[PDB]
Amino acid sequence: IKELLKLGDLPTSGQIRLYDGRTGEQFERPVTVGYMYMLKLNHLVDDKM
Amino acid sequence: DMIKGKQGRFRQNLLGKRVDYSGRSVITVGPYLRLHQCGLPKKMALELFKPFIYGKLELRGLATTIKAAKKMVEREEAVVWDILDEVIREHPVLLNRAPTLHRLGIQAFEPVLIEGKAIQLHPLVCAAYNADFDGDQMAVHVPLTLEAQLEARALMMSTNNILSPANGEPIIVPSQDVVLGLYYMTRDCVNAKGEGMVLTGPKEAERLYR
Amino acid sequence: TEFLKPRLVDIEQVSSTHAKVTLEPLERGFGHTLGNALRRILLSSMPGCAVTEVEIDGVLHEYSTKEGVQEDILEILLNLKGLAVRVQGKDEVILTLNKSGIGPVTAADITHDGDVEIVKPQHVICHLTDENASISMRIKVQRGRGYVPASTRIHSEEDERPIGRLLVDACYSPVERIAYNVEAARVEQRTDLDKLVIEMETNGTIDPEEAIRRAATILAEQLEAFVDLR
Amino acid sequence: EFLKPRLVDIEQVSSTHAKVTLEPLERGFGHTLGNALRRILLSSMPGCAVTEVEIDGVLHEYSTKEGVQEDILEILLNLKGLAVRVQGKDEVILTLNKSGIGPVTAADITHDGDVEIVKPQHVICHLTDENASISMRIKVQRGRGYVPASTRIHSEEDERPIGRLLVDACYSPVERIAYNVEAARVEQRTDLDKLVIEMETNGTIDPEEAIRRAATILAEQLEAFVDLRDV
Amino acid sequence: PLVGTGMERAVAVDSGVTAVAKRGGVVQYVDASRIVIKVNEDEMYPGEAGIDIYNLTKYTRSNQNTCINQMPCVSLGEPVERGDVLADGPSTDLGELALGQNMRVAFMPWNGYNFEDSILVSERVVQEDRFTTIHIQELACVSRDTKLGPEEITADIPNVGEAALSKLDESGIVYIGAEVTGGDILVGKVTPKGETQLTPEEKLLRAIFGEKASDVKDSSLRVPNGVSGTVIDVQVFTRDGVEKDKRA
Amino acid sequence: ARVTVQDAVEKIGNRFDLVLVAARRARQMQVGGKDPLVPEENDKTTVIALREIEEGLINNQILDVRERQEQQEQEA
Amino acid sequence: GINQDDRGDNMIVLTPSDHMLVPDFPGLSEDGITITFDREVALAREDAQ
Ligand SMILES: [Mg+2]
Hints:
Chain G: This is RNA polymerase-associated protein RapA. The structure is cut from a larger assembly and holds 2 copies of chain A, 1 copy of chain B (about 210 residues), 2 copies of chain C, 1 copy of chain F (about 80 residues) and 1 copy of chain G (about 50 residues). By secondary structure, chain A is α+β, with helices and mostly antiparallel strands.
């Protein structure tokens, strides 16, 4: 994983510096970001409500 | 068989009835709420409080008869939403979660009309409900009579129930995010920026931090 | 196209230095943009006057002691930091305090100069004990923008100064505290609109409203160069 | 005794990507202005987009035409991306008519004066039959923000023609905004900063006009704020 | 999936949801309803071979009310081999299982809106229309034979406004493509009325006015409360019928 | 809104007949036989009755005296 | 004892009831009759009494 991150020219540690979209100020202690494969289950609120 | 047994009688139809003016939906966080309030979707609130709406509409004279009040509710004009906001003002509603283990399974809150189809629940009370936001649902009842209103606001209101009936200790303690934030806030470090400077008060401390 | 502009600017001024200000009609998302912009501009860049340096006739270092004052020197510095003075014409002026006798030496006992007004004549400075009760000092006040910590000036102090030149943090901006809450507000059909409640504490001199006034004025002055569709 | 920011060189690297610089920014106002502009740009830029479509041989969104391989829904998805500039009118009706085998791109639209098709290479469909023919009339409106079909359904206003196919309107041209405040050594100053706004758009709004309009809106609202009655 | 395990193709192929070539050849015709392939000479039957045609199935209702739609993968003139994926079944791409979608997440607490296991989502996700699903309800109107007389499907329905008839054809079935809402009359049915025993003068009045003694009651199906969608398909099943109905 | 009823229960420690006296007051208020003794701020009659109880103006005995006075008044 | 359904647009539908006071009323029928009290509505709706 470290090698693959390096090949893309990204920090090997997997954490990036991020800016708060509302205020614009930086967050201390960089955070883990990245893409995850998510699913939407069959429990839809309009059926439940 | 009809008399005896669960499916038959006493348990089902004489201790396990099915009330009116009741609803159900999924629970959601809603951090901005006050401890004594709860987010309630507009459309369910309108449906529940329908007869109150009709009464107030007829009292204000906006509608001659009850059918005109119904038509005015089915068009949904701004006046209807204003009357709904005004009537909802101090009327409290009862919130219940399916396994009512102890008396804190039913509590009263003041509703605030919101968009969406999800009920917004104050975070601090989740521990009391043993509630989790993973598809758990809750039911919502409306007290009608004046004595019911007084009972809900006096005996059942969230702020009146802070101590557990089992032991005297507080029930509403901060759970996970709150304590993490406070912990981060209070811990000190040997060396940083602004070590050992003297401040005249908290206000300039905040000036410095921001 | 045509936007929605705020009306009904209500202001609950409890304790004149402390003002709550409510703005119910605002468009989606502008709550945080305006609150944060206002807060930062108010806090970091505001022209004011403040005490910068002091010379004590008796003590050479901030940890030495004067006989008969129970308060330490650092406490005197902290008390002097709170002095809110407004000079009109002059840029930098040097006030003298000389007091004797028992009791609290307060701001009123300072020598009355022309351009400088002390908004709080009853602000305590020092406490003098019996039978010696000798306090004399010269405090230099300067005009500037924003907040300047001691550390940044003391860094560049290669220009050797006589002993006793005690630097103090300059609190120029008149705002002591500023905060803004954003909350839900609906115009009868549109719910995704918000109310801005701005709580502001100033240091007596100017009332919060006019502070806000010149803040918005300054920001508009910077923006003026681009806006031309009129 | 103040400074004030002047708009300086505006580099254009591509048709969509642009860099705008503001040199003489006072200390501390860099981040404030950067963030304010980012917000205004991302939120409030007015643009035009297709609102509804009528194709001939199709009753509803879910049917299928002979001689095409995409579903109708994918046709709507392709139409959502069309970047167009309307000058004078508020509602324009474009007409697309193509026959024969080939990819029906946006270029085949009948060229009207007031409408500018920014990306003519944008694909719409692929025909697969010599005698297969598609005709459609696309209605394009101007607006701000994001309005879906289902909300506007309350205000139907005679949606009566069953041939009508409503599309969600993304009335917003700006895709991405970044800014950097960096030290602007001015010949008579120690610590000054320059703000650099890097912007990526769908190629409809020009940078200068975007920045001007944003500044206009912010200045107008600030003007509204300046007076305080206290009466 | 950006992060899979490799088993996706096995699962997708082995399920019957994809359309897979049985005899390899060349794609002769591509449409969003059928794929027509010219067989290769190797696998080509000597006697009475012809070509292979695969008709696809478009939106029908599954047991769970989800949509079942197949898309073609291949294009005109592409060569296909036995066991390749021609058409994508539900939630599969080019032979691979694509159950959901892959998005950029950041792990952090954002003003307690993700307090508990709850999730925060950006408006860009709904704007880009990437989590919108299609569902499908089925409704059935049954006309039986009572002993007082068979009910009728005619469009003449007592004391209904012409608004309700507007969307019905002469046969009494909704138009394909019509947008409906809760409470609208899905189909027209009439309940027979018996022993009217009208007076002769009353019978004459009925004759001139046209009032029907046989009717006076409606068994017409209505859209369930609070459900609104587009009629995509209609089917008619007639046990006896003298002749096929127009819609039939 | 009355977020806490602590002063009303501190006025009458039973916490139950509090509800009864407040119900009597709010019932004299709703069916417009009576008038509020406190300037209302667009509150409903429940919170009005609690606000009256918490200020010490109304209890059961004041209810009894006012009712018997009204009885003897209408008796003549 | 005549049920009066208020359709809303100045038109009342009268239908008899189980508690009507006469075996049969001369003008009434079980299917009901629509009426309007406004002369202009009557001039626009000849199906009403
Ligand atoms: Mg759960």
